[PDB]
Structure formats: C-alpha cells, structure tokens
C-alpha cells in the first residue's frame, strides 16, 4: 500500500523554470488519480488517449511528472500539435500524447509586487524542441552576421528572458503552474496501477 | 525597472569587519555575473571581487585575499561580500557591479554605491 | 603579474565640438580584452566601449574604440556638453580587472 507522491510535485513550494523543467519518477507505487480532477481545484485538466474518469483502474510501467510554470496565455500551447515560444523552445509534447496537462493559476504565490524575475523561458533558438528535450543552454544566440564571442550585444542576444509577473498582470500574463503526467508503458511489468 | 541598492556600510573600527549586501531586482539576477568594486575619495576604480553565476569561479583583488569574501543567493537575488581584518585602506565606496554576460568584467548595471570608512 | 594600465594624457582641455582622443598602454598584450567606462562626480560609471571596439547599449556613434594588444585609443569624434567626464579603461585578459588610473576631459574656456 505505497501511494504515488503527487504531493511532492502538486504541493511543491518552488516550481522550476519552464525552459528547465523539472521531471520526476512515478514507480512501485498506488495512483488514486481520481482525487486530482474530483477536486475542482485546477483551471486546466486534459487527459489525451487515456480518459480522465475511470483513469485509476490502468496499469502503467512508469509514470512522469513533468511541472514547470508559464503565464496564462501560454498554457493552450501544452497540448499535442501545438505551436508558440514555449512549445516551439521551451516544452514539446508528441502528436502522439498519452496522458494529461494539469494547470491552476499561481497568481498568489509566483508573482510579486515590483516583479518577480526568478521564473524564465527560452526566447531564441535556431529550431523546434524535440518533444521532451531539456534545453538549458545559456548559450549567446547569434542572430547575425558577426559572432558574438560569448558576449551579448548588437544581433547578440541572451536566449533567456524573464516572466516578470506581477500581481496586477492581466489573467493571461499572470503566472499559472502546471503539470504534465506522461503514462509510459514499458515490457517490465506494470509498477504504478493505483486502484 | 532594474534596481541595485547596497547597504550595510558605514563606520567600522581599524582591524573590525563589515557586510555588505546588494539587493537586485528587475532582471534575471541568478543568470548574471556579479562583482564588486570600491573607488577610494577622489581616486579611480578597483576591482574587489568575482562571483560567478554558479558560484564557484571566485577571484579577488590580490591585496584583499584571505580578508574579503563573497557570496550571492539566487533565490532571494542578494549580493553580499564580508569584509574581515578592515584597513584604513578599505575605506572607498563599494559599488556593486552587474556584468554583461559571460564577459565576467563588463559592467552594464551599477548601484549608487555605499560608503565604507574604517577609521579609529 | 599586475597588468598595469597606464591612460595618456593625465588631463585634457578641449572645447564642445572637438574630437578627442584618450590613450591606454598595457604593460604585456591584452590581446583585445580591453573597454572604457565614463564616470561624473558624485556617479557611478558606465560602460562605453567593450571589447576594445564595441559600443554599449545606448552608446552615440560619436563614441568609438581600436587598438589591440598593448596599446589602444578612445575617440569622441564631436565633444557634446555631456561628453565631458573622466573616462577609465579595464582589462579582463588577467585576473585581477585592473583599471587604468583616469584620463579626465574638462571643457576648454
């Protein structure tokens, strides 16, 4: 009777940046999943191939917990077949996504008064993220002809720009804070059912 | 608007010690180089100390070695620097200094300074 | 070793409209790790020159920098009223960022 910490992940009290987005591990555990969605708490709950309701009675060899934060007009693009900064740059799912995109806004505790610059995502890069690829390199972005020399400046950019929120930030701009449960079922046998 | 306020400063007995502490915000301040530089009354510029965004590439100025430490929490976006076994000679304005990246000494982003005096 | 900077000249008078030019000699090569601050009393400075020939953000074209290994030149090609402050030059080739020790610009009269 090992139960899934979820509240390790839902209830952590920093999340990581969404170009450094966080993973962990669900194994040799018991997933109630049920109590997430019949809390009512979240502004976001998408299940792609499995279903929501009736989720809790699956067998799954592994399970991610991939949680980062964006800001509200970003969280459509944490979907399958999407495009944007932080799917294009930051966050990639396949077309082929199994799982569900959990988001509630975080407006009380991400944002300051003044600004909080703590939470960042990747602004340039040269071409699409794989789906699930971690980039953090803080690399200068050469968007010209002269190189930059690791020095930014003139067509030399920081790849990295900073949210910024603030408490008075219109909802889209405001921060929201999600979770990505990725069911991965591999040969060995099934390690997280949760009845 | 991109802040940088010292304080801490003021007067501290010959052989004493101080701590320093730069408040940054505005700006992405774990992603950035910080450095710290006095400026004696009426003379030019010395680099004190390095501090690398990681934290662990750390250099000072050869006269204040073994003295003088620093340290910076990217949580909080706070530059400190100890000062220990203080001189007469400390005495300058120590501005805190904010490094275009990974150039590790061009300063973009100066605070207005405070005023160290160590004096008996 | 100290990489000593040394500024040329110690003072310069000159009247708005003027080119200037403000000299910086390295005791061994710096390569090209070399920018200029401008500093006015009772201010901390700012950043200029970097690199040896590249402007800083908001830096007017009038501004510009050359030179490489132990010797190089600032010029202000047309002194404006607010050009007139004491500039510094800084090395970053050799912990520790030494600076030069001021060449400063006071208006002719």
């Known amino acids: 009777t090992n139960l899934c910490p979820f509240g390790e992940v839902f209830n952590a009290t920093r999340f990581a940046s969404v170009y450094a987005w966080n993973r962990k591990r669900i194994s040799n555990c018991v997933a109630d999943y049920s109590v997430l969605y019949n809390s009512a708490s979240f502004s976001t709950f998408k299940c792609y191939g499995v279903s929501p309701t009736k989720l809790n009675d699956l067998c799954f060899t592994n399970v991610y917990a991939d949680s980062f934060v964006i800001r509200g007009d970003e969280v459509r693009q944490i979907a399958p077949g999407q495009t944007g900064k932080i799917a294009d740059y930051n966050y990639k799912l396949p077309d082929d996504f199994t799982g569900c995109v959990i988001a509630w806004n975080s407006n009380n505790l991400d944002s300051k008064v003044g600004g909080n610059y703590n939470y960042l995502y990747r602004l340039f890069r040269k071409s699409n993220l794989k789906p699930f690829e971690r980039d953090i390199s803080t690399e200068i972005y050469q968007a010209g002809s002269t190189p930059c020399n690791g020095v930014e400046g003139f067509n030399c950019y920081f790849p990295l720009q900073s949210y910024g929120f603030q408490p008075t930030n219109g909802v889209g701009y405001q921060p929201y804070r999600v979770v990505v449960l990725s069911f991965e079922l591999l040969h060995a046998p099934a390690t997280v059912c949760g009845p | 608007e991109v802040q940088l306020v010292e304080s801490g400063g003021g007067l501290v007995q010959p052989g004493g010690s101080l701590r320093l502490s730069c408040a940054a915000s505005?700006?992405?301040?774990?992603?950035?180089?910080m450095n710290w530089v006095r400026q004696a009354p009426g003379k030019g510029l010395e680099w004190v100390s390095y501090i690398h965004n990681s934290g662990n590439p750390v250099y000072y100025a050869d006269s204040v070695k073994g003295r003088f430490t620093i340290s910076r929490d990217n949580a909080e976006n706070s530059l400190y620097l100890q000062m220990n076994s203080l001189r007469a000679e400390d005495t300058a304005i120590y501005y805190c200094?904010?490094?275009?990246?990974?150039?590790?000494?061009?300063?973009?982003?100066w605070g207005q300074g405070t005023l160290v005096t160590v004096s008996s | 070793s100290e990489i000593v900077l040394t500024q040329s000249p110690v003072s310069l008078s000159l009247s708005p409209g003027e080119r200037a030019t403000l000299s910086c000699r390295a005791s061994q090569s710096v390569s090209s790790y070399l920018a200029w601050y401008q500093q006015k009393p009772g201010q901390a400075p700012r950043l200029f020159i970097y690199d040896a020939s590249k402007r800083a953000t908001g830096i007017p074209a009038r501004f510009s920098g050359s030179g490489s290994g132990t010797d190089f030149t600032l010029t202000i090609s047309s002194l404006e009223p607010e050009d007139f402050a004491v500039y510094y030059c800084?090395?970053?080739?050799?912990?520790?960022?030494?600076f030069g020790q001021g060449t400063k610009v006071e208006i002719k009269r």
């Open positions: 800084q090395q970053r080739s050799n912990w520790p960022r030494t």
């Open positions: 505005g700006f992405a301040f774990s992603t950035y180089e």
């Open positions: 200094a904010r490094a275009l990246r990974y150039s590790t000494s061009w300063y973009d982003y």
